Amino acid sequence: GHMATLKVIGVGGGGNNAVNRMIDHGMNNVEFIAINTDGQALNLSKAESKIQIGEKLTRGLGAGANPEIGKKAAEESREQIEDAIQGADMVFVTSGMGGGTGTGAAPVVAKIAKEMGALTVGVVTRPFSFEGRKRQTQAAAGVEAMKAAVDTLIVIPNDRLLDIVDKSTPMMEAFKEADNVLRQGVQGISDLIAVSGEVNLDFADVKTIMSNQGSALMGIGVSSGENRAVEAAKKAISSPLLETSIVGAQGVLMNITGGESLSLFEAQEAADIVQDAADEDVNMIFGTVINPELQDEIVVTVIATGF
Ligand SMILES: Nc1nc2c(ncn2[C@@H]2O[C@H](COP(=O)(O)OP(=O)(O)O)[C@@H](O)[C@H]2O)c(=O)[nH]1
Ligand SMILES: [Ca+2]
């Protein structure tokens, strides 16, 4: 055996910027892979592994808003993509839908990951409405192709970022908020793999919840004090940036981490928050971790599928 190998793959411009920001944030025990047609951008990537696709197609330029070029680029470079993926137990593919490279290449990358045996999760954005109808239609086709290629898919409509900014919030700060969805999803899985919990969840439970499902939610909530478990649970399933909310989820992996004070009653409260918000008879895979380093803080991690 071995400790489950996680890789995060950015595809196209937005995907590679997300990768750069995650690397800078400080994510460890995860392999980052940068994939792009655009050689200028790739040269500035902080990823250990860089794959320039479509060298013969684009000659180092981007795909110029043509998803067919992105797709053919990924197909041209299938063997480099396979080699980069090799060894992964789980692959996260992140990309902004609507352009030429991500829209076409990301679903090929996802297909390669899955056909190689990796549990494959996509986290992708839809374009802002101000970008126009063609962009939205191209992105929609990209989303549908991603859905057909991944085990689970998380979609972030960029329009939702307009819900969390004020008129002065810098664009890059809004982009960082979107980054949180993938980054915390990855970190929650990394944490599950690395610690043997008092009620343990491991990579086999992640596979059960995420394999061949469709839409997904991945969230984390942290709270302290009086109603900390309910508050943390509510935060975990809060989805202002998510196309897919908790509502309708029929399978949930939920892990609760706390100090020695973590109460049985609290654990039930948190479970009930998730079950009630889903408004379904949820099949739960429940975990608990006692970290005595923690004091009054409680952390609730949720992965929801089965929509
Ligand atoms: N949230 C977010 N969205 C992005 C970012 N970069 C690009 N986008 C979105 O992604 C779409 C495609 O852009 P890009 O990834 O550069 O295109 P590509 O390189 O040709 O695949 C754009 O239409 C934007 O909606 C980013 O850093 N954050
Ligand atoms: Ca564990």
UniProtKB/Swiss-Prot annotation:
GO terms for cellular component: cell division site; cytoplasm. GTP binds at residues 13-17, 21, 63-65, 100-102, 131, 135, 158, 179. Transmembrane segments: none annotated. One of its GO terms (molecular function) is GTP binding. It is found in: Cytoplasm. Changing residue 200 to A: Lack of GTPase activity. Does not polymerize in the presence of calcium ions. Keywords: Cell cycle, Cell division, Cytoplasm, GTP-binding, Nucleotide-binding, Septation. The keyword Chaperone does not apply. It comes from the Bacteria. Calcium ions inhibit the GTPase activity and promote the polymerization of FtsZ. GO terms for biological process: division septum assembly; FtsZ-dependent cytokinesis; protein polymerization. Homodimer. Polymerizes to form a dynamic ring structure in a strictly GTP-dependent manner. Interacts directly with several other division proteins. Belongs to the FtsZ family. Essential cell division protein that forms a contractile ring structure (Z ring) at the future cell division site. The regulation of the ring assembly controls the timing and the location of cell division. One of the functions of the FtsZ ring is to recruit other cell division proteins to the septum to produce a new cell wall between the dividing cells. Binds GTP and shows GTPase activity. This is Cell division protein FtsZ. The chain holds residues 12 to 315 of 390 of the full protein.
